[PDB]
Design an enzyme around this catalytic site. Structure first.
Site: not given
Ligand SMILES: [Fe+3]
Ligand SMILES: [Fe+3]
Ligand SMILES: [Fe+3]
Ligand SMILES: [Fe+3]
Ligand SMILES: [Hg+2]
Ligand SMILES: [Hg+2]
Ligand SMILES: [Hg+2]
Ligand SMILES: [Hg+2]
Ligand SMILES: [Hg+2]
Ligand SMILES: [Hg+2]
Ligand SMILES: [Hg+2]
Ligand SMILES: [Hg+2]
Lengths: 340, 340
Positions: B84, B115, B118, B122, B204, B237-238, B241
């Site tokens: 990410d 991203e 994301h 983390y 992805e 979300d992924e 993508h």
């Molecule tokens: Fe991501």
């Molecule tokens: Fe992604």
């Protein structure tokens, strides 16, 4: 040469904002400058979707407007579209490849993204008031007065990007490319970045103001209220953007970041001054084009002009520059209720 | 020869997705491929902030896990942070300078923006479960096991970036640069984009999945539930993508967008197949790594590996590549309770 994931284990806290090692790990647990982490959190708290602002009455009000007032609304819309179009991609394409600290990298990206939200809002407004948007969108690139009165913007970005490419590929030195001598110098690149940054700052500090004031004037005659709510949101975002460029410029000035940037800010001071002055003039000229095939009742080219001077002085002083205009009080304090 | 606002009034519907005139006006009243606008719409509707998911109880759960389970949890987080970190920056730096249709331009800045959220998530997780995040963040850049994947991924984006720079600076031809011959061919440039787009699809498509699986394994056990909540937002979300890269690839391959791209897609087939498989094997070796110290309860190396093989065949087929593994049913149907 640029790399999307530098393999050197670096202490990100000691890199300069720009020209250091490209950012590798995106972490947000510590920051060299917390102002950037604050700005990201704030922009995320202000997230809005245009889709959620009812603008149905505006088609009615717009329809009922005199042609002269309609030209004012449309023209401004066209102008804001040009700017936000540029502001959506530019920070990403121009600065991202030069950033060396994570908080600033993510800020730039959050800032460029919020500009895309603005762009989307124009589409939303436009398709809700005119039966065919292409009339508006197609007169942008061609509008001789928008390009004329907004000449110089893509310019700083375009040259910066080109310079950056030469520097990422060739590195510093004098080279021979296709028989031509080409010289690549980092100090020169830093000047190009600094002045780009000072132009974005001007864009963010002054360029939207005459549009906002028009939009808001409409709202004071109790017309175009959905548009006004959107502009209110947009303005609130632009205030954060500006706060972010002022800080970058000021931190660069203090010599607390890269020390070479402190010498450059000082040696470029006159050009900083001139571009701001050039921008003010551009806005003033816009003021005429608007107050052209007629005008308005509550505002006029002179009032606009006074305001542009009023504002340019506030903004130039925030970044430590001298005032070019006579000091005056806000000529349209009513704008203050709608602002920030 | 790249500009932030091309001055040519062009028909944006007639332009290819990449390598056409750079995008001037960002309008969304019309689109050549509705898919990208749809993607922007969903991604905005899914907006979320990590800060609002409480990770506090995850602290006691992680502290109570067996040591080798703590290694798995953490290594995974480290790997996700890597991917990410590259994904927040790359698509913008790599694609934006080559896109010629606005919807694609915007989708790519929205995608990359999600991203950054994301990565922010983390840090939120890491911050809430360990005492010193610097212990986690400082072991990603040089952690041997993570490293190999990083280099492989960065490579594609990096070569693409460099060739784009020469292309825009010198255009096509055989050029000399300091005594050296440098050939710039758009054909080759197209080839490099296709391949980097192919590796991001694999990224992805498959690389995050194996990390998900492990996250969801703990959740199945009622452990580390804040994390599992965040990972669920992430995997949602992924899915968008991947939908994007799949569409891009398929449009290119069909020759519908640029005839030459169909020729390039065929010439490139074997190598795309080789790259997807190479990606898959890394995930496998990664699993073998995670479980060197012993299985975590409910998941083991062998199952995981079967899972990689199963998801790979799916993704591959979706982009018209031959299937490299023996067909199987999903070996861990329970993952579906957490995915979409
Ligand atoms: Fe991501
Ligand atoms: Fe992604
Ligand atoms: Fe904006
Ligand atoms: Fe802005
Ligand atoms: Hg700039
Ligand atoms: Hg600029
Ligand atoms: Hg200068
Ligand atoms: Hg200055
Ligand atoms: Hg790539
Ligand atoms: Hg790519
Ligand atoms: Hg796991
Ligand atoms: Hg290929």
């Amino acid at each position: 040469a640029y790399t999307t994931f530098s393999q050197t284990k670096n202490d990100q806290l000691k890199e300069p904002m720009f020209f250091g090692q490209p950012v590798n790990v995106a972490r947000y647990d510590q920051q060299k400058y917390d102002i950037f982490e604050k700005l990201i959190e704030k922009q995320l708290s202000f997230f809005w979707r245009p889709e959620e602002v009812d603008v149905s009455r505006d088609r009615i009000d717009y329809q009922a407007l005199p042609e002269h007032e309609k030209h004012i609304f449309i023209s401004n819309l066209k102008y804001q579209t040009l700017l936000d179009s540029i502001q959506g991609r530019s920070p990403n394409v121009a600065l991202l490849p030069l950033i060396s600290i994570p908080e600033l990298e993510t800020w730039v990206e959050t800032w460029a993204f919020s500009e895309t939200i603005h762009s989307r809002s124009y589409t939303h407004i436009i398709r809700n008031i005119v039966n065919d948007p292409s009339v508006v969108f197609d007169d942008i690139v061609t509008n001789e007065q928008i390009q004329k009165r907004a000449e110089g913007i893509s310019s700083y970005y375009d040259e910066l990007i080109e310079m950056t490419s030469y520097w990422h590929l060739l590195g510093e030195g004098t080279h021979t490319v296709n028989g031509k001598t080409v010289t690549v110098s980092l100090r020169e690149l830093k000047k190009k970045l600094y002045l780009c940054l000072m132009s974005v700052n001007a864009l963010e500090a002054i360029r939207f103001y005459v549009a906002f004031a028009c939009s808001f004037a409409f709202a004071e005659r109790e017309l175009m209220e959905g548009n006004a709510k959107i502009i209110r949101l947009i303005a609130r975002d632009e205030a954060l953007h500006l706060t972010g460029t002022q800080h970058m410029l000021n931190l660069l000035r203090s010599g607390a970041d890269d020390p070479e940037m402190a010498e450059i800010a000082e040696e470029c001071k006159q050009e900083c001054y001139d571009l701001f002055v050039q921008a003010a003039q551009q806005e003033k000229d816009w003021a005429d084009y608007l107050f052209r095939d007629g005008s308005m009742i509550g505002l006029n080219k002179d009032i606009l002009c006074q305001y542009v001077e009023y504002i340019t002085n506030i903004r130039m002083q925030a970044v430590g520059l001298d005032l070019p205009f006579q000091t005056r009080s806000n000529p349209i304090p009513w704008i203050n209720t709608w602002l920030v």
